[PDB]
Each structure stands twice: as structure tokens, then as C-alpha cells.
Amino acid sequence: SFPKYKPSRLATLPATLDPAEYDISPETRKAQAERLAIRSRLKREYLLQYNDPNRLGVIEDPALIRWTYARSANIYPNFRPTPKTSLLGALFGIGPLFFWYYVFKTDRDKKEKLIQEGKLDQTFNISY
Amino acid sequence: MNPFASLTLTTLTILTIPIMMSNSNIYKTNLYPNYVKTTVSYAFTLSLVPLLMFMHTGQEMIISNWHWMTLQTVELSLSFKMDYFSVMFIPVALFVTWSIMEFSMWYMHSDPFINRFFKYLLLFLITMMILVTANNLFQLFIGWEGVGIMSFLLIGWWHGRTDANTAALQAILYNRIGDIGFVLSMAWFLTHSNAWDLQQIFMLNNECPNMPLIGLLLAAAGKSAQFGLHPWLPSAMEGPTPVSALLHSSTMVVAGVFLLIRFYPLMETNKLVQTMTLCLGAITTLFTALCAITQNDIKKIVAFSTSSQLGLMMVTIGINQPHLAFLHICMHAFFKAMLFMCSGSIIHSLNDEQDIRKMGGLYKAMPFTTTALIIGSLALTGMPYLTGFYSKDLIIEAVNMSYTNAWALLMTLIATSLTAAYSTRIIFFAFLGKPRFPPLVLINENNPLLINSIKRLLIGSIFAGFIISNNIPPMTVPNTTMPLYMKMTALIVTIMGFMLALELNNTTYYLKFKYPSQTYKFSNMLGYYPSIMHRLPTYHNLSMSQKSASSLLDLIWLETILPKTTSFIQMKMSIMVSNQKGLIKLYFLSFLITIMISMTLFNYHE
Amino acid sequence: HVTKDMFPGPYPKTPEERAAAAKKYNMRVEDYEPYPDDGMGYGDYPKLPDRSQQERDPWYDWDHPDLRLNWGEPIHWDLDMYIRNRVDTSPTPVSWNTMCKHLFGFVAFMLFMFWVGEIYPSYQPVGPKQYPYNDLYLERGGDPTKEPEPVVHYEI
Amino acid sequence: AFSAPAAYLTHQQKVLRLYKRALRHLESWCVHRDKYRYFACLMRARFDEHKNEKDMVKATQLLRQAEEEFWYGQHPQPYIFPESPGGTSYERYECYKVPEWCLDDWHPSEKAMYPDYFAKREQWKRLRRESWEREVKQLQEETPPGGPRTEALPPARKEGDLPPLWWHIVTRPRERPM
Amino acid sequence: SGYTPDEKLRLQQLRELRRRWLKDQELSPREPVLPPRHSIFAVTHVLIPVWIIHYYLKYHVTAKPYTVVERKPRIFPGDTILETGEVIPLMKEFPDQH
Amino acid sequence: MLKIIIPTTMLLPMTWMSKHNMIWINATVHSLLISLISLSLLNQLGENSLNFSLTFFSDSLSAPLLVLTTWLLPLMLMASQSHLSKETTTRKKLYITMLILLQLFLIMTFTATELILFYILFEATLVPTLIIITRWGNQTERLNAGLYFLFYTLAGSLPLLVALVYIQNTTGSLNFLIIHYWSHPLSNSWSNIFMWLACIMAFMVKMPLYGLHLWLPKAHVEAPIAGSMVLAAVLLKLGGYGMMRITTILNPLTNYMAYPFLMLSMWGMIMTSSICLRQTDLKSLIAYSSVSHMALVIVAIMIQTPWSFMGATALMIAHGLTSSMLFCLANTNYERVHSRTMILARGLQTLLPLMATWWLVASLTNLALPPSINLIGELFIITASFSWSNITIILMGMNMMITALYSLYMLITTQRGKYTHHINNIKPSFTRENALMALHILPLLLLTLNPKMILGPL
Ligand SMILES: CCCCCCCCCCCCCCCCCC(=O)OC[C@H](COP(=O)([O-])OCC(O)COP(=O)([O-])OC[C@@H](COC(=O)CCCCCCCCCCCCCCCCC)OC(=O)CCCCCCCCCCCCCCCCC)OC(=O)CCCCCCCCCCCCCCCCC
Ligand SMILES: CCCCCCCCCCCCCCCCC[C@@H](O)O[C@H](CO[C@H](O)CCCCCCCCCCCCCCC)COP(=O)(O)OCC[N+](C)(C)C
Ligand SMILES: CCCCCCCC/C=C/CCCCCCCC(=O)OC[C@H](COP(=O)(O)OCCN)OC(=O)CCCCCCC/C=C/CCCCCCCC
């Protein structure tokens, strides 16, 4: 009836436009109940320490520790040299260097050749 | 000893005294804002005298007072330029700051940190004066970055709010993109002219090449929020209303334009950079005036109006009329600050509401604010013999009668129609009709601070154009002869914009409902420019800086090649060497092999 | 007081390993899904949906209201990219790939029109401006020892 | 913000939320009051036209079509209340909010001013210390063996009890703290 | 629909406690127990700084060459010079297009 | 210049003879007095250096470095006494002894007239740093950090030693004055290329050069606060000082041997600035910042112009002060919350306003706000690079945009937003911490007032 909205990576699909939430099953209801139970258990565990009058300091969060560890220390032990890894490493670690080397070498060779011929307009060029 | 120099220096010097007193027993009392406002008013009154001297005899100066450091052949000194631009801009900025500070005494009365707010406002003013009066590029850069940092601090005034911090960082990002061009210009000038001061740069560049001027244009586009780097100015409305009235409408955002006005002798000799400036200004003014006509936040409308007027200033610079652009800066400051102050008065009256759809009939409920806003809108549209007329009308006539890009001319005319259109939108939705605000009415504008500030800016918006135009020497040749229809072009297009906007606004009273067109969606969502440009490049940059720079290279491959390979090789060789069973049979056989090899390889050759 | 078992591990292969990983990350087994087992180094960490923090419900009582996070729940790999001071993936009124077409079309049209207006400029029906002293030869750079070719203007 | 959420929304809840959203966006389109009232009455008639549909599948199909129409015809710039999550004053006063425990670190000269206030604070702290263990015991009793299933908390039931986990709700800083 | 009796009761109890806490934030009449000319602005903020600046410019800055450079005054036909006393002649017998 | 060396050697037994509860007071007082004495070295000439004896000399390049070292010792002492309160008296005296020995080695390194004596002292600085890191670091990774700190250095410096002795067999001297006066060009042969690499790689790994920098995040994150201060502020500048000394004998080979290092420096400056945008640990962000600034310094030294040398000197001094201040600022929060995760403690401006002001000023100096000496050095280097090639303004320009971003990002993450609700142990700032921040920041602006003292011999 109306023009259709299509989602993208940086502009996602709205919940009210999602087909999965319009055709539901008792299995889906059970899964939602389990999700809410997990969230409620975590919320109770946090709130018990949050309201503790004898608690002074920082309530340690295992999820934050897991996130930082995964982002920092768990990366190399889970690395394998593969065609994708090797190709991406070679590209993004070597290509820019040679690209910039070619650019700068060409520019400086042109400038040097111009200077040898004596046509660069270096008047008032005292500081370098 | 010709009090010109002493008075020009004292005007800037006395502004720093409350900064030095910010650690005394006046910053802790409730008398600090009045003290700062009185200091600014005294500074304005003192600065009025060098302006009179210049208007009498055209007196100009440069003062190189302190020698900072000297390179081998480059000497860096604290020097101030006191030409027409400085001595004209300083009183205007001081007058506007005085009015806005008196307004802020009433607007920010409930802020627990009002003293810090005034201290912040004064620091911005000092940095802007440093920018304006600078005689060398390093001092100008000091003022540049100072006003940038002060704007960053004032945009994120409510630092517990996420959107304000995001807007402040956005302003910093766009200004840094401009600062790249600023630094390019500085490096080119030092390596080619051996100077950073204006006099030697003017002497040694009779036909300026493209690179320094393009760097200056990039810096100006960053500072004045031109089309490529425009979105940060409307988002800067996250700050308090006085910050919007002072920094982001009338004083700081013209700085980029001011930069191009400073280097007009070099720009006068380069046609390509002039054409680029003209086209940039034309597209900026058109796009911003087109975005402004559908906005519902009043601060957003006024910000887009400011951006469109900056685009018009860039157009004026592009047609080789820098003095007209400076005059337009001076004219626009008055009524733009007044319009922002009237918007702030409305917002404070209606319990901090900024949507025009919830402002009803304020024509009778808010008489003085209505009068001031009407006068400001009429001045903004170039109504004859008001302040905006004496600059905008001449700008339109000069654009008409020049050898110029035709598309830029067309966009300038369309933009000056859209100006009247969005002025009509503001007036119609905010002041006419029936109330649409909540029923508990707290409308009250009876406060002497607000009334006096707005009245001062209103007298300015009525008479400053005539007074300033009749008191400056003529630096341009007047367009004496023109066809009658081209003499009336600005008035005609303004009238058509008025009528069309009035018709399209009157149609809203009908009992008809229709879904919006794609053109309306393009206008309201700002050409989708912030939707795409603030999501795609940012996502790709951050994702690449995690996935590739941090993980693929620094955490994996750089580790893999040098240290991990060395550790692996040494460990394997250690295992190979040290793992022997301890049986004398095996390594005595090894001894026999060694003896035979040493007898053949080394001993047979002597 | 976090044990070694709690810390993230390698990519799980057996279903028992997947169940243990889901238990470690406070997730249901059918909801837990790791990154594909390439050599990139993700290991055990779950692949959460790519929505930013701006999309989360602002009317819920989050443990961290500004971050819109709850204590103990699994954190997205790219949380610092999605902190809502930053990249936003929220649904838009107009489709992506339609905003892009309109923006690119507007920009390209303006560029082409500026080029056209440059090669079809606008001007008044007048001749060049006339300057008295040989086009002000001495004023625009001097050189008073060359006797330039005279520039003469006549009355009309 | 105050109520504990459920595991899912029901069909009636979704219909009512769509009705409120549609009316708000229509008001955003219809700026004037009389026009908004007219079109809001039309929208209410359109909503209650299909109120008595006994077929649930058809009801959800109608809801789906209505949500698609809403997404097509939504106002790109709808009116937001200034303190609502999208408003201009959403988190304006969060920088002025200071937690109460900071008062424990005031220098005794600072506490020499406001003696009565700090005496009342000591009384409140004594009450919290005396109530904590009973709150914990009540939560232990009332919780099902497989952990809690919702985020709803029980009230006080005994003679002089206090509702468990009350301190950080009762001692909120303020809506306009400074 | 609506609150369950448990939710209602918890809301009433929390509301009573919160109202007590808000009442306790009020200040008694003594709570801030504190422990123990006209035109002088124009003198200390204008006159003294201008004295210092004028002294610094007159006797220190202008003691070195090219520190305060002014562009020369405009000279028009019919003017007389203050130093030399020389007068400047008039302008070549205007054609008088009256 | 024994009038500076002998008082530090006297600090040693003064510390070891002090009463158990007066070690910090005595060490701080006499360290400050030694800094005041060393202030007299700033009186330099325009033609040659101050040649005190056959063994020690002072130039316009080494005098600000010596002043920075002697000024950093009392700040390190002030920053260390908080987390060492539970330590025994003997171990506290040993820690102070390590700091004093490091200062002595640095002072003698910056003034040695011969290159082998310079090498010996510049390697001797390794032992106290390694001991400090591996004995007083907090986490288990410190051990690995120590190893990364050691071998990365030595694998660079062992070839240099060989080259040095080889040079002494060829020219007969390693005295720097003789080396400068009797300079001869380097021809284009494989032997000369490898001599150039042997003379350059140790200083390259000290800066560190991008690609050889992996030791730095580990060592600067795992170290105690004084270790991080001295690693960022002074020990990174050994590479730059040594490179500016050694380049006098490498011409005209440098003219083309600098290309790979220039490309690495520029691209890796962009890369490390980008890495700073996605960092969860606050100390690692500051370390990668140091890497970017040192890449700028490497470019300046490699292009070999007077403006680039002045910019390099100014940038080294400014970065030392700024990075030390940033490490101290991060350490205050770490001592409060015992975690280095940046997003753990937020909205600290509401709880600690003056510390927030210190954070703002430090981050402003990090992004080189004019007219700070950070900006002066950066601008001089950028101008020299522009003269070297007009295209460099692209990469440099990009760097200027990224730096500010991450700098402000850091500030916005820690000071703004709302405070974390469950963190209730944030005590008011002590006088010691505020004094530490002030003693970092005030010299920066004072040096801005008189920039020719940090601009070097050029
Ligand atoms: C005499 C000599 C001089 C001759 C001059 C020319 C002669 C003609 C005279 C009149 C000319 C213009 C008349 C008015 C225009 C119509 C106004 C209007 O709103 O119509 C309603 C209608 C939409 O109304 P709506 O959606 O129902 O409103 C929503 C509600 O009302 C919500 O209500 P609301 O409260 O939110 O308010 C909505 C708001 C705004 O509502 C909107 O959003 C609509 C925007 C329309 C106004 C924009 C005008 C500026 C044009 C700049 C374009 C530059 C080039 C861009 C190129 C794009 C490239 C893709 O309304 C307003 O505020 C008023 C709008 C402006 C009125 C003032 C007009 C002055 C400017 C133009 C006239 C200039 C006069 C002097 C000329 C001087 C020159 C010498 O607009 C249009 O559809 C027409 C707009 C024109 C766009 C054409 C662009 C092309 C589109 C298709 C592209 C083709 C693609 C082909 C393939 C390509 C492949 C690559
Ligand atoms: C992770 C970061 C580590 C630090 C980075 C250190 C950078 C070191 C890079 C060395 C720069 C250049 C070294 C030598 C200069 C020229 C090299 C050569 O490629 O150029 C041509 C040399 O020609 C050929 O290329 C021959 C060399 C080929 C064999 C070299 C092996 C290089 C392959 C890459 C291995 C990776 C090395 C680094 C390991 C980590 C020039 O032709 P030619 O004029 O005749 O030689 C000049 C010398 N002459 C005059 C004495 C004759
Ligand atoms: C010169 C070389 C570089 C030129 C610039 C190229 C593009 C640079 C890309 C920058 C990537 C930085 C990634 C990290 C930034 C921090 C994250 C961030 O900024 O958050 C996004 C934040 C949130 O978006 P909002 O719309 O404000 O929503 C908030 C309300 N809910 O928005 C932003 O700040 C995004 C700003 C990025 C701008 C990038 C596009 C600019 C491109 C300029 C090109 C035009 C040149 C102009 C030429 C003028 C004529 C001479």
C-alpha cells in the first residue's frame, strides 16, 4: 500500500516493522520468560549489594572484566595465520607504507629536478 | 603622545581584570556578574574614542610592544593592528556583549554557577579581541583556538547531558578540519615569504599562488560553518541561550569571514580562489535558508538564518567587496543578537519550551518582545532604511552588476527570498493565532534587565546602519547607474517570499491532512547530511581503528614477527640442544664424527 | 574475585563447551552465538546484535542510566563505538539508500550547475574600466625606468 | 520508569501504544487545536471500527498494516516534551545531582553549620542500619527457589518493617537538586 | 489492569518514606551557622591601567625603532603643512560641469 | 659539573641514614634544592658549549633535559609515598635508592663528552628501571613487561656498541667535539649502510619507532607511578638526544636512509592516534599518545633542519611534562577505585571539581593549544616537514584532528556524564595530589613565557 522501508547497517529495522514479533509461538513466550528470569536474577544480585549499608567501595562487575580481557589479552591466544588474516595483515600493514613512499619519492624527485634546472622560484626562501 | 595607541591597548587590557579577580572575594559573592557587565560597559565607552579619532582623521596604527622570541631571520613579537576593521569591530562586539551580559543576569538567575558563566563569557570576549586585533598569524591562531576552546566549554555547559557533550566535540572536530588549512597557510607563508606578520606578507606577494589562499579558505569555511562543514553550528544550540546569542550568532562565527577580510589584498589577485569562495557562499546560503523554512525549534531557525547570512557574506567576499562584507558583519550583529534574545525571552516565559508548535498568540501577551522581534525580522529582510538595508541591499546590487557565476547569482536571489519566508514562519507560528502552551500561564517580561538590553539592541537595529554608513570613508566605487527592475530586485524577491510564505502558512488552518512530500522530508531532515555523514565515516573510522590498527597489527602481526618468532625459535633450539639421554655411547660417537670432520675440513686445508 | 574459568576462552566446538560458554556469559544457550572461527582472535566472546546504545529503551531503570546498561549483562564487543556519544544505528524515518541518493543527487546537481554557470557567466553590457596613467603603470608595481607602451583612452 | 516490566507486551498493550503514538504524531502534524481535535476524533473512529474482531490473526494483521502506515506517515520532527528522552532539557540537571554519601566526607567545620540537618541524617542512617537485616530476611523468604522471575519487589508486611531495598529509592537526590 | 495490591502497598510505603525524607531536607531558621566609594571604579579600573599603559608606551615601547608605526596622514590640495609651512596647490581648474 | 653530581650521591647515604619517618621529607627537600642548583645550567652561549672538563660538558640541548630530570625526581617522590605506606622501611629506602641511582645515571648520560661513556650510562639506566617495574608493579604482567623492556632495548644497543668501537679504530676518537670538527662524509656502500643502521637502530627503538614500540604499552602500563613518570618524561628522550648527537657523522647517507623511518613515523603516528580512539585502559591511551608525539620527534630529527631540531627539542620537553602529568592524573583515579578501566568511574567533575580543572588543562596541553610549547614544537616540526615536502601537511593535518578527538574523548569519558551509582568511596582530593598537579603544570606555562630556553642549540 505504502512505500516500504528497508533497513541498513547504520539505520536498522524498527521493532514494530519486524515480522518475527508478529508471528509468535509458545516457544517464543517461554524464551522471553527465561530471558526475563535471567535479567531478574542479575538485577536482584546487583541490588542486594547496592543497598547494603556496610558496603564501601566498587561493586565488581564480571561482565566488564570479561569485556576488557577479551578486548586486550584474549586476542593473541585465539589468533591463527589464515589466508584472510595474512592477506589483511599484509595489505593494511605494508600497502600504505609503500603508497606514501612512492608519493613522497616522486614529489621530491620532481622538486630536485626542478632545482637542478634553476626554475623553482626560491626567492625569499631563507628559513627551512 | 597621540592617545590612540594607549586607548586601544587599555580597552583590551581592562577586560582581563575580572579574570585576575576571579580568585578574590568577589567571585564568591552575588555581585560578580554585575561587576563583569560594568567592566564590559566601561570598555565599550572607552573604545568609542579611538573610533571617533579614526572617523575624524582616518588614523591607523600597528603596535609591536613585546618581543617574544626571534628565530634566525624571523622575529616574533606581540603586535596589534589598529586599522579600520579593528576599531570598528571592537565597539560593536563590546556593545553586543554588554547587552547579552545584562540579559544573562536575568536569564541564568537560577544557575548555581552563574559566576563561572560570566567568567566564561568574558574569557571568550578576550580571545575574540585577540583574534580581531592580531597583526601576525601566530597571534591570530592564538585567538582562533582560544575562541574554539571557549565555544567547546560553553556548548557543554550542562555537562551531565550527553547531547551537549556530543555537540561540543562535533564543533571541535569541524574546527580542527579548518585548522588544518590554517596551519597549511602558516607553513606556506613562513617558508615562502619568511614572515608571519601581515606587512611583509602583503609586500612579498604581489600575485599570490593558490595554496595559501586555499588553506585560508578552508580555515574560513571551518570557522564560519560553510556547506562542507556546516552542521556543527545548528547543533551548537545545545548551549544556553546567551551563548547562542553571543558566540554562535553574531561575534565568533563571523571570524572565518573576518579572516578572508584580513587577507583581501592577496585574494584580490587570484581569480580561482575568488570563484571558489563565491560558489561556496552561494551554496551555503541557499542550503541553509532552505533547511530553515521547515524547522520547528526556534533556536534552530535562527541558527540556520545565521548560517545563511554567513554564506551571503562569503558571496560578498567572492565578488571582491571585502569592505561591504565587513559592514554586513557589523550590521548583522545587532539584529541577530536581538532576535536570539527575543527567542530566549519567549523560551523563559513558556517554561523552557522551544517548539514553535506550542507557542500560540504572544502578540498581545508579550508586547515588547513582539515589537523587538518584528523590528529584528524587518531589519534582517533588508527593509528600507533600517540597519540591514545599508549592507544587504548593496550586496544584492553588487552581485547583480558584476561579472559573476550565474548559478551563484540565482542561488543568492532564491536564498534572499527564503530569508523572508522563514522570518514569516517564525512570526506567524510564534505570535499570531490562539495559544497552544500549557494552561498554567507564567508569561512575564516585566524585568528591567531584559527590557533594557533588548531596547539597547533595538535602538542599534534601527539607527546603526545610517550612523555607520554616513561616518565611514568610501572605500568602494558606487553603482550609480542601473536598470530600474534590477534596482528593485531585493525588495521584489523579499515581497514574493513574504506572500508565498503567508499563503502556505494560511493553508494550515484548513481541515485537510496529507502525508508529506519527499521535498519536505529533504528540507526538514537537513538534506540528510547529518544522517549520513555522522554515521558512515565515524563508523568506518572507529571500526578500522579497532579491527586493523589495534588488533590486526599492534596485537597480532607486530607481535608475531619480531618477539613471538624469536621466542618460538629460541625455545625450539633449546629443546633440540638440551634433550639428550645422557648415554656416553651416543655423544662419543658424536666425538668421533667431530674429530673426522675437523681432520678433513679444517686440517687438510693449511 | 573472578576465577579463571569465568574469563573468556577459545572458540567452542562441542555443544557442552557452548553450553558452558553461555552459562559463563549469563545467556541462554539458544541465544549465545560466538564469532565465526577465523584467526581474528574473538575466541569465546559472544556476537551480540549490532544495535547502538541509543536504541535501548530510555524509560527502563538501567543500572547505568547514561550508558543504558545493566550490571552483569554481556557487553557488546564494540560498546565504546556505540556509547551514543558516537555512532548511532537507530531507525530513520526515511530509508537508507534513499537518503544517500537524494544527498548525492543534490550535491552533484549543484556542482554541475556551478560549472555550467561558470562557463555561461553573467555580466552587464559595458566595456572595460578605463584608468588614466597607462593603466596606472607606476602605481601597480612601479618600474619607472622602462617606458611602457602607452595606453590611450578616447572620448565617446 | 517506576513499574517492573513484563516478559512481553500483549496485543491490547501494543494497540494502545500505537494509538498514543499515532495521536501524538497527528498532533505534531496538526498544529492547531481544532484541526487536531477533528482528526483525532476521526482517528478514534478508525481505531474502534475494528474493535470487535474475534479473529486474532486478522487483528494482528490489521495491527501490522497500521504500524507500517504509521512508519510511512510519521512526522520526521515530532513534538517532544522538553524533559522527555528526546527533549531539549532531557538531562539538563544531572550535573547538579550529588549522591548523599558525599556528605559523609564533609570536613567537621562544614558540618558545624547545619547541626539539625546532620542530626536528622544520623537518625535516618540508624533506621537504615536497623532495617537492613530484616529486609534481607524477607527477601530470602519470599523468593522462589529458582530465583526471582520478575523485578517486582514486595512491600513490608510485619509490624514495623520497611519495604526491602528502599534506601536508594527514598534518598533520590531531587528533580531540581541545586 | 492497574496495580496489584502488593504493588499499591509498596508504593504507599515508599511514598510515605520519600515524603518524610523530602521534609527532612528543609532548613531550620538557624541552619547556616556562619562562623566569625561611589566613583572608585573609574579610578582603579580605567585611570590606573591607562596610566600604566601610557607610561609603558611612551617611555619603553617607543624607545626602540619601528615599534609604533602609524600610516601617514592624507594630504589634499589646498592643505598647509604644520612642520614646513608649505601649502599644496589647487586642482587644475575643474571643467565645471554644472 | 660535579656540583650537581656529588649532591645526588650524597642523597644516597642521607636517605640510608635518615630516621624511619623522615625519609620522604628529607629526600623531597634536597631533591628540590638540587633542582634549584641545576637551574644555573640554562646560562648558555651562542657559539660553543660549556666544556666543564675532559669528561663532562653542557650544551643548549642537554641543559633543559637535566633540569627536567632533576625537577622530576621530587615529583616522583611525592607521587610514590601514597601507595608505599604499608611498605617496610628498608624496602622504601631501596625504592628511593633506585630513583636516586636513575637520576645519577641520567645526569651523567646527558653530559658525557665521549660516546662510549654515554653508551655505558645509557645502558646503566636499564637496571633501576627494570628493578622498579618488576619489584613494585602491581599485576602479574609486570614480569613480562620487564622482559619486553629489556631485550627490545638491548637488541638495538648491542650493534651500536660494535659500531662505536669500530669508529674509534677508524678515526681515533669518540670525543664529540673532535667528532664534530673532524667530520667526513659517508660514501654509498653496503658497509656504510650497515654502519648507519647500527648507529641508528638503538635510538630508534628507544623513541620508540612505530613497529618497534610494543614494549612501551606493556612497560608503561605495568609500572608503578614513578616508573611511568620517568619512563615517559625522560627515558624516551634518550633516543632523541642520542640521534641528534649521532647524526653529525652520518651525512650524506641519511639523505636516503631516512625514507623507511620517515614513512613509518608518519603513518604510525596516524595509526597510534587512531588506536587511542578505541582504548579501554586509561594508561594505555597515554602510552600510545607518547608514541604519536615521539613519531613527530623522529620525523623532525630525520629531516635534519634547524627548524626541525628546535621543534624536536621543544616537543621533547613539553611532552615530558604533559605525559607525566597525565599519568599522575590517571593514578589518582586508580588509587581511588583500584581499576584502570576508563568507563568504570564517570562524572568525576561532580565529585572532584579541582581535579577536573587539572584534567582539562592537561588535555588542553596534550592537543597543543596555542601558545603552549607543545604547539610551538609541533608547529616548527610541521613547517620544516612542509619545506621537506608539501604533501606532509596531509598526514600531519590528520594527526592534529585525531589527537584532539581522543584527548577530549578521554576527558569526556572521565569527568562528564553522570557518576557511577555504586562507587561510593571517592574521597576528596588530598593537598599532595593538587600540589603534584600544580608543580607539573605551572612550569609549562612559565616556559611558554620564555621559549628560547627549550629551543636547543640551533
Ligand atoms: C518574476 C521573475 C522571477 C521568476 C522566479 C520564478 C518564477 C516562479 C514563481 C514561484 C516559484 C516557486 C513557488 C513556490 C514553490 C512551491 C512551494 C511549496 O512548498 O510547494 C509545496 C510542495 C511540498 O509541499 P508539502 O510537502 O505538502 O508541505 C509540507 C507541509 O505543508 C508542512 O507545512 P510546514 O508548516 O512545515 O511549512 C512547509 C514550508 C516548506 O515546505 C517545503 O518543504 C517545500 C519546499 C519548497 C520551497 C523551496 C524553494 C527553494 C528552491 C531552491 C532549489 C535549488 C535547486 C535544488 C535542486 C535539487 C536537486 C535534486 O513552507 C514554507 O515555509 C514556504 C516555502 C517557501 C515559500 C517562499 C518561496 C520563495 C523561494 C522560491 C521562489 C523564489 C522567488 C523569487 C525568485 C528570484 C529568482 C530571480 O513543494 C513542492 O513539491 C515543489 C518544490 C520545488 C522543488 C523542485 C525540485 C525538483 C523535484 C523533482 C526532481 C526531478 C528529478 C529528475 C531526475 C534527476 C536524476 C538525477
Ligand atoms: C618493523 C620496523 C623495523 C625498523 C625498520 C628499519 C628500516 C630498515 C630498511 C632499510 C632501508 C634501505 C636499506 C639499504 C638501502 C637500499 C636498499 C635496496 O633495496 O636498494 C637498492 C639495492 O638494490 C637491490 O635492491 C639489492 C638489495 C636486495 C637484497 C636486500 C633484501 C631486502 C628484502 C626485504 C627483507 C626485509 C628486511 C627487514 C627485516 C625486518 C638500490 O640499488 P643499488 O644502487 O644497487 O644499492 C645501493 C648500495 N650500493 C650503492 C652500495 C650498491
Ligand atoms: C582533511 C582530512 C580529514 C577530513 C575529514 C574526513 C572525515 C573525518 C572522519 C572523522 C571520524 C572520527 C571518528 C570518531 C569521532 C567521534 C564520534 C562522533 O563524532 O559521534 C558522532 C556525532 C553524533 O552525531 P549527531 O548528529 O550530532 O547526533 C547526536 C544527537 N543524538 O556526530 C559527529 O560529531 C560527526 C562528525 C564527523 C564529520 C565527518 C564529515 C565531515 C567531512 C568534511 C568534508 C567537507 C570538506 C569541506 C570543504 C569546504 C570547502 C573548502
UniProtKB/TrEMBL annotation, chain B:
Belongs to the complex I subunit 5 family. It comes from Sus scrofa. Pfam families: NADH5_C, Proton_antipo_M, Proton_antipo_N. Residues 68-118 form the NADH-Ubiquinone oxidoreductase (complex I) chain 5 N-terminal domain. This is NADH-ubiquinone oxidoreductase chain 5. The keyword Nucleotide-binding does not apply. The chain crosses the membrane at residues 6-27, 39-58, 84-105, 117-134, 140-160, 172-191, 211-233, 245-266, 272-294, 301-319, 325-347, 368-386, 406-432, 453-472, 484-504, 582-604. Its EC number is 7.1.1.2. GO terms for biological process: ATP synthesis coupled electron transport. GO terms for molecular function: NADH dehydrogenase (ubiquinone) activity. It is a multi-pass membrane protein. One of its GO terms (cellular component) is mitochondrial inner membrane. It is an enzyme of class 7 (translocase). Residues 134-418 form the NADH:quinone oxidoreductase/Mrp antiporter transmembrane domain. It catalyses: a ubiquinone + NADH + 5 H(+)(in) = a ubiquinol + NAD(+) + 4 H(+)(out).
UniProtKB/TrEMBL annotation, chain D:
Keywords: Acetylation, Electron transport, Membrane, Mitochondrion, Mitochondrion inner membrane, Phosphoprotein, Respiratory chain, Transport. The keyword Transport applies. It comes from the Eukaryota. It is a peripheral membrane protein. Mammalian complex I is composed of 45 different subunits. Accessory subunit of the mitochondrial membrane respiratory chain NADH dehydrogenase (Complex I), that is believed to be not involved in catalysis. Complex I functions in the transfer of electrons from NADH to the respiratory chain. The immediate electron acceptor for the enzyme is believed to be ubiquinone. This is NADH dehydrogenase [ubiquinone] 1 beta subcomplex subunit 9. It comes from Sus scrofa.
UniProtKB/TrEMBL annotation, chain E:
Its main location: mitochondrion. GO terms for cellular component: mitochondrial inner membrane. It is a single-pass membrane protein. It comes from the Eukaryota. The chain crosses the membrane at residues 39-57. It is found in: Mitochondrion inner membrane. The keyword Ubl conjugation does not apply. Keywords: Acetylation, Electron transport, Membrane, Mitochondrion, Mitochondrion inner membrane, Respiratory chain, Transmembrane, Transmembrane helix, Transport. GO terms for biological process: mitochondrial electron transport, NADH to ubiquinone. Coiled coil: none annotated. InterPro entries: NADH_DH_b-subcmplx_su6. The keyword Secreted does not apply. It holds the Pfam family NDUF_B6. Accessory subunit of the mitochondrial membrane respiratory chain NADH dehydrogenase (Complex I), that is believed not to be involved in catalysis. Complex I functions in the transfer of electrons from NADH to the respiratory chain. The immediate electron acceptor for the enzyme is believed to be ubiquinone. Belongs to the complex I NDUFB6 subunit family. Complex I is composed of 45 different subunits. This is NADH dehydrogenase [ubiquinone] 1 beta subcomplex subunit 6. It comes from Sus scrofa (Pig).
UniProtKB/TrEMBL annotation, chain F:
Residues 1-109 form the NADH:ubiquinone oxidoreductase chain 4 N-terminal domain. It holds the Pfam family Proton_antipo_M. It is found in: Mitochondrion membrane. Keywords: Electron transport, Membrane, Mitochondrion, NAD, Respiratory chain, Translocase, Transmembrane, Transmembrane helix, Transport, Ubiquinone. It is a multi-pass membrane protein. It comes from the Eukaryota. Core subunit of respiratory chain NADH dehydrogenase (Complex I) which is composed of 45 different subunits. This is NADH-ubiquinone oxidoreductase chain 4. It comes from Sus scrofa.
